[PDB]
Structures are given as structure tokens and as C-alpha cells.
Design a protein around this ligand. Sequence first.
Ligand SMILES: *[C@H](O)[C@H](C[C@@H]1CCNC1=O)NC(=O)[C@@H]1CC2(CC2)CN1C(=O)[C@@H](NC(=O)NC(C)(C)C)C(C)(C)C
Ligand SMILES: *[C@H](O)[C@H](C[C@@H]1CCNC1=O)NC(=O)[C@@H]1CC2(CC2)CN1C(=O)[C@@H](NC(=O)NC(C)(C)C)C(C)(C)C
Lengths: 306, 306
Amino acid sequence: SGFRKMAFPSGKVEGCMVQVTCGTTTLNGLWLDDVVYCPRHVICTSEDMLNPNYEDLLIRKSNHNFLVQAGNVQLRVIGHSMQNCVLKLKVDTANPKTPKYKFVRIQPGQTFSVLACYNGSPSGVYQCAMRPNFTIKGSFLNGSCGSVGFNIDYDCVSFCYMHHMELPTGVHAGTDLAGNFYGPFVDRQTAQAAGTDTTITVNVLAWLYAAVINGDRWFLNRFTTTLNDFNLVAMKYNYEPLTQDHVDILGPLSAQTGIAVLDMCASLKELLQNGMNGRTILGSALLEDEFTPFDVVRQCSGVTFQ
Amino acid sequence: SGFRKMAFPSGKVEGCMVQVTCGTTTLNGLWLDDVVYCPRHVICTSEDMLNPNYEDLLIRKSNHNFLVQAGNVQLRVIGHSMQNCVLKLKVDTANPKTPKYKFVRIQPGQTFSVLACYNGSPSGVYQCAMRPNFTIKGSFLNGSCGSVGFNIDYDCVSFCYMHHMELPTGVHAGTDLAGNFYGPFVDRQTAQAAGTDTTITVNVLAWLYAAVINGDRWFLNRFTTTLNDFNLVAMKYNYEPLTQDHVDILGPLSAQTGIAVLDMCASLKELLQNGMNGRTILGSALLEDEFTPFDVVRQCSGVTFQ
Ligand SMILES: *[C@H](O)[C@H](C[C@@H]1CCNC1=O)NC(=O)[C@@H]1CC2(CC2)CN1C(=O)[C@@H](NC(=O)NC(C)(C)C)C(C)(C)C
Ligand SMILES: *[C@H](O)[C@H](C[C@@H]1CCNC1=O)NC(=O)[C@@H]1CC2(CC2)CN1C(=O)[C@@H](NC(=O)NC(C)(C)C)C(C)(C)C
């Protein structure tokens, strides 16, 4: 037992990270087969970042302008294209470490592992969620752009996020691996702001089931609630609405613990209305919302990957 | 910016994990050069676990009793020895993925990354601390024994922990890679119990510096305190004593933020005495103690590894 914020093993992704340098900008790229993917603002300069016209900017570039370091080795660029906000550098060598992989665009509420990188070298791995307002609460310094987020499913890496920028609240915005931003954000330095976040209700319920699986029961009650009456309380506390579909997803966990979904909703309702009274759940004094129902079942049953 | 519980990239360790099966027991082993390291209770049976005599148990074994899976391959055992509570299986193939590495026995308060494994296959990676009572608050199910904890320093993996058992409070006990248990624990099923844990004071102060680096300042004050008067408050709240040596270690962080160590102690004192008044620090409603001063400097400055 025990319950931790757990990231996927990062080895399959580490073998893909490279350094991309162009002009005065250095950031990370993702090397899969003979293509290196990276944020298109690598073509920008310190004065370009204001309101750049990237199509104009890119036509002025030559392959040799792009310096691509894979550890201790030049990769030669032989072609380049732009897809949405990502740049695709064709290189003359296929990455022999290329895992089985997929690109996926995730829904808000879904979680992933981030391999933070600088200069093409991995620094650390941690677990994030796509917030309802399409930011992520990351840990990113200058040079971290092109670090990716991902999930692993048996032997297949599903890449879902590439880091582009930091918002003035200290949170982070980026794209899928096809270069489409999550949320309303754009890669230019104009006024943008997150807009109001909310708590991921179905994940909070999943984490309460994790707590029960692990022996914290102090918050259970004999009450129950209807879905409608629960959502009336949810909206007051800035929680996302719980749909019948969420209820269905929580079925396995409800079946393992013996606690009907709407009974767990009654418990969340009283925790919202009363607070925790000096008590903790799974070592937290806040209601945790960055574990999905799948995350809870993975970690409480022990699923692996090769 | 941002601040997360960050583990080391796990790739160098993933390449070392193997499956060790003997009789009815299956657990994980660590394959470095031509030796596989694993917990010695793999030689035990369901009735052996009570009060076993492992030296008697081991003399009854033959090399061929030990089944060692490295993915899709038999490794043949050609010799075996016992060192403290770990078993060392000599195999006829050196691991070509063996990283540069070291075995280190860590002090309480120090943190490390755990690569949780089942059947020789990595499941997830998370960050832990060695508690003052020499347990770790892990996430471990049946089959996880032989999963290791580690730190990485440039290109060198320092292995510091191997998982052996779970205590009735849901926390975990294990050894260094030379097989010596951390704390008073033994690998037999007799009454054992953790004994009273305490909060890692120097780490809490490091995390408060992280908060300042990241823009949370609401908890600062103009007070200060002496070391003696701080430790008088520490002991009341079950915090470990802060030594002058801890104060010295916190020097770099104090210099970066402009906040003298003993001034940060004055702030911790008021947080201990007043609580947080509905406020959070770095997204936590509790005072966090599983980041060392080194962890904070690593993540706030961006150090990498190859
Ligand atoms: C790439 O490595 C870098 C990562 C940042 C640096 C600090 N933390 C991070 O995550 N990304 C950038 O530097 C990007 C590149 C652009 C688009 C041109 C600017 N940028 C930023 O992150 C900006 N942020 C903004 O300007 N944000 C808006 C426009 C106000 C929303 C800063 C952080 C450099 C100011
Ligand atoms: C190895 O994979 C396994 C990991 C455990 C299983 C549940 N969570 C874990 O971390 N370790 C064990 O099964 C070890 C092997 C022994 C020494 C023989 C027993 N054991 C345990 O963890 C015991 N725990 C205890 O018996 N603890 C004491 C003696 C009461 C302190 C249990 C969990 C199997 C009961």
C-alpha cells in the first residue's frame, strides 16, 4: 500500500531528446525516426517575439541555420516544415532509440508525465494534469521549451504535450505534438491570461476511492445524494460538474470498495461544506485532483509496461 | 517557475531491472555487470517467513533453483552468495546497459527516487525521503521487493535503497544495496514497529526558500529568532533539531533570496504556532519536508545529467 504521485518510467522518452539551437535560442527537440519536433518560436529573435510572422521568418531560414545536438553528435538537417506551432526538422539519421509511439491530444482533466529537459539533457520527471482552463501547473525554467509530456500504455509512448511558454501567474501553456495549443493561447508575447480554473471533480472522487483502498475512512458517512443535488454543491465550490459518464467511469472503483459513487459524492459534499477539521487524506490537507480514475486503478493494482 | 515533486529520469535504472523467481516467490533484481542483487527473503517459503535461518536455507539451494528473466531472456546463475540481507546471484552475462554507478548508504532526511517494479518491469517513478525513523512512505504492492531507490549525479547512478517489506502502518522498510537495513528492522515476520516519526526541519526551511524563489511571500515577517529559541519551538511541534550545520547548508538559498536563515526560522515558528489560516504554500496546506536544500537548488536552477 501507500499512494504517491507517480510518473511513468521516462527511459523511452529520454532516448529521444535532442538539443536544437538556432541563432541565439537554444531549446529541446523530440527525435522520432528521422524528424526532430520542436517549438516554432526557436526561429524567433529577442525582438521577434513581439508579434512575429513565422511564415515570413521561416522562409528566410536555411537548413544549416538549425544546429541539432544528439548528445555528442551533429545531426544534419536536410529539410524543414512548419505544422501549426511546431517545427519539423528532417534529419539524415533515424533515431535508433525510437520507441513505439503515438501522438494524442488529451482532454482537460487527463494526467501525464513531464520529462523536463535543458540543452537536450533530462533534468527530472513529474506528473501533471491538463487543467480545465488548459494550463498545466508545471516546473519549467528558461531553456525547457520542447520538453514533452506523455503517457505509456504497455510498450507504446503516447506523446500529448510539448512545452512552449509561461503565463504571468506562474503556470504553463503548450501544444500537442501536432503543434495545436491547448486552450486559447498563442506563441507571441501579447496579453493573454488563463482565465478561471476549476477543480476536477471526477479526479477528486477517484482519489477518495484511493484513500479508502489504502485505509483512510474517516470521511465516509451513511448519507447519499442525487447527482443533481451534488452538482448544486459542486458549482458553489468551483468544482466541475459531474456527469453520468464520470459516474460510469468510477464504476470499477465503486465496485472494489463497496461504496456507491453517489455515496462518495455525499462524502465529498460534507468535506466541501465542513473542511477537514485538522485531518489529512493520503498525506494531504487539501482535496487532490490530479489523479484520474485510471491512475488510481493503475497504482492500486500494479500495472507495468515493457 | 513552479515547483513539483520531481524524480530523477529513470532510464539508467530501467535498463538494470530483472525478474528473479525461486520456488513460489517472484520479485525484482538489480543487474549490474555480471551480478544480480535481490532481497534474500526470495529463498523463503510461505511457512519459512516466520523465523527463518537464511544461512541454513541458502546452503540447501542450487544455482539452478534461481530463475532470472531479463525481459525475454534467461540469464543463467553460476554462483550465489549472501551479504547481510541481500543475495548476490552471479550470472554468465554482464549487463550491457550497466550505467556508471555507486552504492551509498544515505542519512535520514535525504531524498531519493524510487522506480517501482513488478515482474522485472518498471511501473512508475516517484520521489521519497528516508524518514527520521528510517521508514519510507512508499507505494508498494506484493511483488515490488527488489525495486530500488537512487539519486543521479551527472552520469553516475547512486543506488541507496532496496525494498524489502511493509510495516503495519502502511510504510516501508528496506536496505542499502549492501543489504544492511535502514533502522532497527529485520527480514522476518516478528513484531516490529516504526516508532515515532518527526518532521525534517531543515527540509521544511528549504521548501520555504523554494516558495520565496517562486513568489509566495505571505508567510515572511520582520521577526527573528535565536537558534536555541527556535529549537525550543521545534521540539514542541515534533520537529527535528536544527543544527548549525543545517544553517550552513541553507547558506546558498539564504544568499539567493536575501532572507537570513534565522529569519526564515522566525517564519516557520509563526507557521507552527498559528497554522496557515486557510492559505497554501506551493500548492500545499501542510508544511512539506521531503525536499532537501540540494533538491531546491537543483530544481530552481535547472541542473541536468547525461
Ligand atoms: C522556452 O524555453 C521558454 C520557457 C519559459 C521560460 C520561463 N519559463 C518557461 O516556461 N518559453 C518562452 O520563452 C516563450 C517564447 C515566447 C513566445 C515567444 C515568450 N515565452 C514566454 O514563455 C514568455 N511568456 C509570455 O510572454 N507570456 C505571455 C505572452 C504574457 C502570455 C516569457 C516567460 C519569456 C515572458
Ligand atoms: C516483497 O515484494 C514484499 C513487499 C510487500 C507486500 C505488500 N507491500 C509490500 O511492500 N515484501 C514482503 O512480502 C516481506 C517478506 C517478508 C519478510 C518475509 C514479509 N514481508 C512483508 O512485507 C510482510 N510484513 C511484515 O510481516 N511486517 C512485520 C514483520 C509485521 C514488520 C507482509 C506485508 C507480507 C505482512
